[PDB]
Amino acid sequence: SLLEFGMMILGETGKNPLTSYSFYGCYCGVGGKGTPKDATDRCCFVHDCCYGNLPDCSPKTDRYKYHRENGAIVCGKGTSCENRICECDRAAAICFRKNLKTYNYIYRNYPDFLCKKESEKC
Amino acid sequence: SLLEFGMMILGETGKNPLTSYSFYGCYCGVGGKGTPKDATDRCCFVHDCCYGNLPDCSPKTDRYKYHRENGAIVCGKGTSCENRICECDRAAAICFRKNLKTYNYIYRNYPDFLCKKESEKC
């Protein structure tokens, strides 16, 4: 669920997701459209695609468990849905971490009006 | 949404919600029933009741903004639904903080089978 996802982002990046990953670029936030502005934004695009590929699940609300082994996120053994949702979230958190090096505050609060370009397909 | 709720619990209590408030007593977790075991558990019961009183909203998934003024949680100015959801979450986070003093690890992983008592009404 989004509860676990927020904690996972914080644990993996060191950044509060509400201030760094909630209104960024064209995809990190509500109503994603157009093309990703940078690598960080593309993490959000790919996460949206991952959730969209799970119509038989409830990715935002279905709780799951995770932990760490050797510093790394390990998803718990849950239902098929919980496992798939957790893997979407894990992939995204690791993507944010790997792309911290090109994070740019200039894309915070980027206006949706400038994302009115043909939306990239998953 | 649950994303904000998790961050709010962490910020207010200092505790990871996934390890302290996700499998506790009869109500802090999935499928709450019976009677709250202690004050902390009753925070979860009341939060469930608060969300249940918002059938015209989507409390688990509707994102909102919050911040702090003088150390205290202040909900952002959103839709009526966002405002109401945020106030449910704020109340719960502050309830957890106020009842840290009676938190008991013995109620972690409390079995649902022992909560098969007539469920308290909201």
Swiss-Prot record, chains A, B:
Effect listed in the UniProt record for changing K77R: Is 1.5-fold less toxic than wild-type AtxA, and is similarly enzymatically active on anionic POPG vesicles and 1.4-fold less active on zwitterionic POPC vesicles
Gene Ontology terms for molecular function: calcium ion binding; calcium-dependent phospholipase A2 activity; phospholipid binding; toxin activity
Active-site positions on this chain: H47, D89
Gene3D superfamilies membership: Phospholipase A2 domain (1.20.90.10)
Binding-site list for Ca(2+): Y27, G29, G31, D48
Positions of the record's site feature: Putative membrane binding site: L2, L3, L18, T19, F23, V30, K60, T61, R63, Y66, R108, N109, F113
Location in or out of the cell: Secreted; Host cytoplasm, Host cytosol
CDD domains, per database record: PLA2c
Miscellaneous: Negative results: does not affect mKv1.1/KCNA1, rKv1.2/KCNA2, mKv1.3/KCNA3, hKv1.5/KCNA5 and mKv3.1/KCNC1 voltage-gated potassium channels.
Subunit structure: Monomer. May also bind to 14-3-3 proteins gamma (YWHAG) and epsilon (YWHAE), and R25, a mitochondrial membrane protein.
Protein name: Basic phospholipase A2 ammodytoxin A
